[PDB]
Structures are given as structure tokens and as C-alpha cells.
């Protein structure tokens, strides 16, 4: 099309895939490299409580991991304002830059702005057995609603976007929890 002035694409990986409150004006299915996703976060704000944790997702550094999810494009000339109200809603996360890969095999791989959990974020619980991660799920809700329905959304999500070969951590955990 026509060369914009600036850009700024966020990548997708949690609750962003399926629910954005922020504008955007574009959206592309893709994958990054060098991490993997897992249900190593506590949540005592959305999906569990102070007391009773439910479990998100967070990435980890893995060099033969990939995460498949959705690239945002921020408004142009809104960029700085959205990556404002992005940044100062992370309850806190780092930001990097990573190349994120088109699904489509039309459009070039480019540089996206990434949110990464820290080990020094408080809710952080850390790794699990799968049993375990899926009970916590099972019997966790909070302000934003219950734990399963969050890995249901994520699960329908990345299913409607490419195989489940794409995330056999999520899947197991689904059709782990679906048991119940």
C-alpha cells in the first residue's frame, strides 16, 4: 500500500488474541521464535484472587520454543500514546523487540514490541506438573471471570488460527481440564 510515517505493532499472546480494549488498524496471525508460552503466572486480579491464584500465561526465554498469536498495529501517530496505556496497565512486564512471522506467505517477517513477565513480578508462581496447573484452573475465578473459561478462549482461539501441534502445553492443559 502507501508508506506510513511511523509504526508499532504489540504481539498477542494471552487474553490480547481474543479481547483489546486499545485501537488498532491492522492485525495479522503469526508466530515468534526463542520463546514458549506456559501457565507460570498467578492471577489474583482477572482469573483468580489474593489467597486462591489462578494461572495465565507468561513467555520463557526457549530457544527452540515459537508462540503463535496475533500482531496489533498501534493508530499511526497514536503509537507512543497506546504503548502509554499498554505500559502502565503491566502489572511489572518487560518490553523487547522480537521478529514476528506472518502466518500469511505474502507478507515479510518484521520487528514487534514484545511484554515479557519478570521472575521479580510478584504473581509470577513459576513451573508446575500439568495435573496440578489444571486443578488450579478448575477451581480458580476472579474479578474477570473463572479460570477454565480464560484456557477455553485462549484454546478455541489458536485452534480457529492453526493445528494444535502449534501448542501441545495449552491443548494438553485443555482437554486435561475438559476431563473435569
Given at each position: 500500500?502507501?508508506?506510513?510515517?511511523?509504526?508499532?505493532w504489540?504481539?498477542?499472546?494471552?487474553?490480547?488474541?481474543?479481547?483489546?480494549?486499545?485501537?488498532?488498524?491492522?492485525?495479522?496471525?503469526?508466530?515468534?521464535?526463542?520463546?514458549?508460552?506456559?501457565?507460570?503466572?498467578?492471577?489474583?486480579?482477572?482469573?483468580?484472587?489474593?489467597?486462591?491464584?489462578?494461572?495465565?500465561?507468561?513467555?520463557?526465554?526457549?530457544?527452540?520454543?515459537?508462540?503463535?498469536?496475533?500482531?496489533?498495529?498501534?493508530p499511526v501517530?497514536?503509537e507512543?500514546?497506546?504503548?502509554?496505556?499498554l505500559?502502565?496497565?503491566?502489572?511489572?512486564?518487560?518490553?523487547?523487540?522480537?521478529?514476528?512471522?506472518?502466518?500469511?506467505?505474502?507478507?515479510?517477517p518484521?520487528?514487534?514490541?514484545?511484554?515479557?513477565?519478570?521472575?521479580?513480578?510478584?504473581d509470577?508462581?513459576?513451573?508446575?506438573?500439568?495435573?496440578?496447573?489444571?486443578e488450579?484452573?478448575?477451581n480458580?475465578?476472579?474479578?474477570?471471570?473463572?479460570?477454565?473459561?480464560?484456557?477455553?478462549?485462549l484454546?478455541?482461539?489458536?485452534?480457529?488460527?492453526?493445528?494444535?501441534?502449534?501448542?501441545?502445553?495449552?491443548?494438553?492443559?485443555?482437554?486435561?481440564?475438559?476431563?473435569?
Open positions: 500500500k502507501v508508506p506510513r510515517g511511523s509504526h508499532m504489540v504481539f498477542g499472546y494471552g487474553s490480547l488474541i481474543w479481547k483489546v480494549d486499545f485501537p488498532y488498524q491492522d492485525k495479522l496471525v503469526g508466530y515468534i521464535t526463542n520463546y514458549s508460552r506456559r501457565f507460570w503466572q498467578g492471577s489474583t486480579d482477572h482469573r483468580g484472587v489474593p489467597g486462591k491464584p489462578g494461572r495465565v500465561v507468561t513467555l520463557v526465554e526457549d530457544p527452540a520454543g515459537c508462540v503463535w498469536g496475533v500482531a496489533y498495529r498501534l501517530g497514536k507512543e500514546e497506546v504503548k502509554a496505556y505500559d502502565f496497565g503491566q502489572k511489572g512486564y518487560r518490553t523487547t523487540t522480537v521478529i514476528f512471522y506472518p502466518k500469511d506467505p505474502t507478507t515479510k518484521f520487528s514487534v514490541l514484545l511484554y515479557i513477565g519478570t521472575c521479580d513480578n510478584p509470577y508462581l513459576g513451573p508446575a506438573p500439568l495435573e496440578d496447573i489444571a488450579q484452573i478448575f480458580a475465578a476472579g474479578p474477570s471471570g473463572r479460570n477454565t473459561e480464560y484456557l477455553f478462549e484454546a478455541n482461539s489458536i485452534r480457529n488460527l492453526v493445528p494444535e501441534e502449534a501448542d501441545e502445553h495449552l491443548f494438553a492443559l485443555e482437554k486435561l481440564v475438559k476431563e473435569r
